[PDB]
């Protein structure tokens, strides 16, 4: 499939990107950073967007327009590269941890009032000021279900990231809907929701500022407190007749 080719291209980007000139020397930037972060205990990296464009313009162009699948492939590639760089791990740490990839770019920021409906499921960069936050709750990623009658088990079910659930099966494969989630067989991550307010100068005359709901996950939680000026990079998505609430899956924060 094309997914394997895209994953291989992302792995090649991670393993082969270098910075510097032959007059001084060359240093691999993302492989070294991945090794250092994984050894330190922080499982994340900050991948710029101009670097990916310079390596492969098509790959960067597929991240500015279909961020979901391409970001998932990039995270899997980062996990594989991090696993191969630190292959002989000490006893007890054989299992490889999952890596979270954060994005950054130097583009001119947009406005909250400029977000049209055409730019849905696209990477956006909007500034603002945080005015609210919520308690750090839990969000599941891997779940296992079990039948109530015949106690059949279907494990390792994956749940999509963001404010999206998982429709449970009806047929038992034992009445209708016999499946319940096993409590202890669930892997969870951190989870927080913020509220971004339009900048005090971009607000037009004689009008109250507008707001926008944000979503933060894993290492992005507990990074911004109310009253901070931030620049947010995230995926515009949806959570009256046909009206749907829209939020922003945050994949990068630059506190000012």
């Amino acid at each position: 499939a094309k997914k394997s080719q895209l994953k291989k291209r992302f792995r090649e980007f991670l393993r082969q990107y270098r910075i510097g000139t032959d007059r001084t020397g060359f240093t691999f930037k993302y492989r070294d950073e991945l090794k250092r972060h994984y050894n330190l205990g922080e499982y994340w990296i900050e991948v710029e967007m101009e670097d990916l464009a310079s390596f492969d313009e098509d790959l960067a162009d597929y991240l500015y327009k279909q961020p979901t699948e391409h970001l998932q492939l990039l995270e899997e590639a980062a996990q594989e590269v991090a696993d191969e760089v630190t292959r002989p791990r000490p006893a007890g740490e054989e299992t490889i941890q999952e890596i979270q990839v954060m994005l950054r770019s130097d583009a001119n920021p947009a406005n909250i009032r400029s977000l049209k409906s055409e730019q849905m499921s696209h990477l956006v960069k909007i500034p603002g000021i945080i005015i609210a936050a919520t308690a750090v709750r839990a969000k599941a990623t891997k779940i296992s279900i079990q039948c109530r009658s015949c106690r059949n088990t279907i494990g390792n079910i994956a749940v999509r990231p963001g404010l999206e659930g998982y429709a449970m099966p009806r047929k038992c494969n034992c009445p209708l809907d016999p499946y319940f989630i096993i409590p202890d067989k669930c892997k969870c991550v951190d989870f927080q929701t913020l509220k971004l307010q339009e900048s005090p100068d971009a607000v037009p005359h004689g009008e109250l500022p507008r707001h926008m709901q944000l979503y933060c996950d894993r290492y992005l939680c507990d990074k911004v407190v109310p009253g901070n000026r931030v620049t947010i990079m995230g995926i515009y998505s949806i959570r009256g007749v046909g009206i749907r609430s829209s939020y922003i899956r945050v994949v990068g924060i630059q506190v000012d």
Binding site: T24, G25, R36, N39, L40
Partner: protein, 202 residues
């Protein structure tokens, strides 16, 4: 090539006569009891009205004085262990050694703990074991923090480390920066020493 080379402190039960750090570690006070009174020395105790310290009083004498006046006969002075080295804190250390703050417990933990072995006690075989196991348990995190930290503020990583561990952190950080500067081709420059630049700052 380091120009200035001060005398290294001596780890274990023996100090160095010319070591400055060992000259400050022994300054730390240790609980003591005056088994035989010190006549004409009562002026040391401001609260005491008599000119002679009475027999049986308890004072927190410095480590150097306790070492000097100590005798196995225990007829001039007796030594009580500090709180950090008794069983209550030893069990906590045995629980997990990476969570404690060995900079507030004592700036010199290993050195003072080893110096405590000079005074005879029935708990020395346990104090030595506790110190050794603490070092063994805290080595790995120090190594990982020192090696894998490039161009980042290290004040957050050395805020819970005593002086020996801080020296090990400096060694690791200088062993990493040398390789990183070599790979980037900045190790081929003839540069002035840090002492010259610091003097120029003045």
């Amino acid at each position: 090539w380091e120009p200035y080379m001060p005398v290294e402190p001596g780890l274990g039960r023996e100090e160095n006569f010319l070591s400055l750090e060992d000259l400050l570690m022994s300054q730390e006070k240790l609980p003591c009891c005056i088994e035989s009174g010190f006549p004409r020395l009562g002026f040391l105790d401001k609260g005491g009205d008599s000119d002679s310290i009475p027999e049986g009083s308890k004072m927190e004498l410095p480590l150097w004085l306790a070492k000097g006046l100590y005798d196995n006969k225990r007829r001039v002075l007796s030594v009580e262990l500090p709180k950090i080295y008794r069983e209550g804190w030893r069990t906590v250390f045995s629980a997990d050694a990476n969570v404690v703050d060995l900079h507030k417990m004592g700036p010199h933990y290993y050195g003072f703990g080893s110096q405590l072995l000079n005074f005879d006690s029935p708990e020395n075989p346990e104090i030595a074991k506790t110190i050794l196991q603490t070092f063994v348990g805290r080595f790995r995190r120090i190594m990982d923090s020192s090696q894998n930290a490039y161009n980042e503020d290290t004040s957050g990583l050395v805020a819970r480390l005593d002086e020996l561990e801080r020296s090990l952190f400096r060694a690791g950080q200088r062993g990493l920066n040398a390789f990183q500067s070599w790979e980037r081709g900045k190790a081929a420059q003839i540069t002035a020493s840090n002492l010259v630049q610091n003097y120029k700052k003045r």
